[PDB]
Design an enzyme around this catalytic site. Sequence first.
Site, mmCIF file in Angstrom:
data_model
loop_
_atom_site.group_PDB
_atom_site.id
_atom_site.type_symbol
_atom_site.label_atom_id
_atom_site.label_comp_id
_atom_site.label_asym_id
_atom_site.label_seq_id
_atom_site.Cartn_x
_atom_site.Cartn_y
_atom_site.Cartn_z
ATOM 1 N N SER A 241 -10.916 11.259 -4.774
ATOM 2 C CA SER A 241 -10.568 10.973 -3.361
ATOM 3 C C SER A 241 -9.049 10.716 -3.292
ATOM 4 O O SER A 241 -8.414 10.537 -4.362
ATOM 5 C CB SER A 241 -11.384 9.826 -2.825
ATOM 6 N N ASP B 79 -5.922 8.433 -0.968
ATOM 7 C CA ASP B 79 -5.545 7.419 0.058
ATOM 8 C C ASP B 79 -4.381 7.955 0.907
ATOM 9 O O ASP B 79 -3.433 8.498 0.341
ATOM 10 C CB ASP B 79 -5.149 6.110 -0.601
ATOM 11 N N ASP C 57 -11.416 8.987 -8.871
ATOM 12 C CA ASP C 57 -12.708 9.599 -8.451
ATOM 13 C C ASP C 57 -12.494 10.928 -7.714
ATOM 14 O O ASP C 57 -13.498 11.497 -7.264
ATOM 15 C CB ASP C 57 -13.527 8.638 -7.579
ATOM 16 N N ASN D 3 -8.704 5.787 2.480
ATOM 17 C CA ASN D 3 -9.339 6.567 1.391
ATOM 18 C C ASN D 3 -10.248 7.650 1.981
ATOM 19 O O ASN D 3 -11.014 7.326 2.900
ATOM 20 C CB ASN D 3 -10.094 5.569 0.513
ATOM 21 N N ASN E 262 -6.911 9.046 -6.066
ATOM 22 C CA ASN E 262 -7.728 8.048 -6.816
ATOM 23 C C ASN E 262 -8.327 8.792 -8.016
ATOM 24 O O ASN E 262 -8.385 10.023 -7.938
ATOM 25 C CB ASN E 262 -8.764 7.375 -5.907
ATOM 26 N N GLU F 75 0.872 -1.197 0.000
ATOM 27 C CA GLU F 75 0.000 0.000 0.000
ATOM 28 C C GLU F 75 0.904 1.241 0.000
ATOM 29 O O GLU F 75 0.672 2.148 -0.780
ATOM 30 C CB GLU F 75 -0.969 -0.006 1.192
#
Length: 129
Positions: A50, A52, A48, A59, A46, A35
């Site tokens: 958003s 992380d 969209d 997120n 991301n 990660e």
Amino acid sequence: KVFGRCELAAAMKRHGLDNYRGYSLGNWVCAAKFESNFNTQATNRNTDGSTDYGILQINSRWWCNDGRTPGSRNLCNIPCSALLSSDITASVNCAKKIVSDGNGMNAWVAWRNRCKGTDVQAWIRGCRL
Ligand SMILES: [Au+]
Ligand SMILES: [Au+]
Ligand SMILES: [Au+]
Ligand code: NA
């Protein structure tokens, strides 16, 4: 903070992740590896809109407020900035809520694709815990 493997395994063990909702320590350490590369400061946008945040790449869509993710939840009641500390308490405590969600660790795409059904025990071998 870039943790070592055994260093993160120890810190995750202290903060109560070892076999938490049935996931062994090795899952969580493997998850952190793929990660964030063990880096508490890791951020990734991301598609969209958003973002992380941190060692477990939590997120903004659901779990934290970063003040630029419109129409999203803050189900952990924290600023996403809290997830970038060298102290992983907040990341761990928000991950506990996430993994209880009823989708378990499948919510971490890197865990599902790279850790799920692998020999996750390899991620803690040689560590004092
Ligand atoms: Au904790
Ligand atoms: Au995880
Ligand atoms: Au810690
Ligand atoms: Na949010």
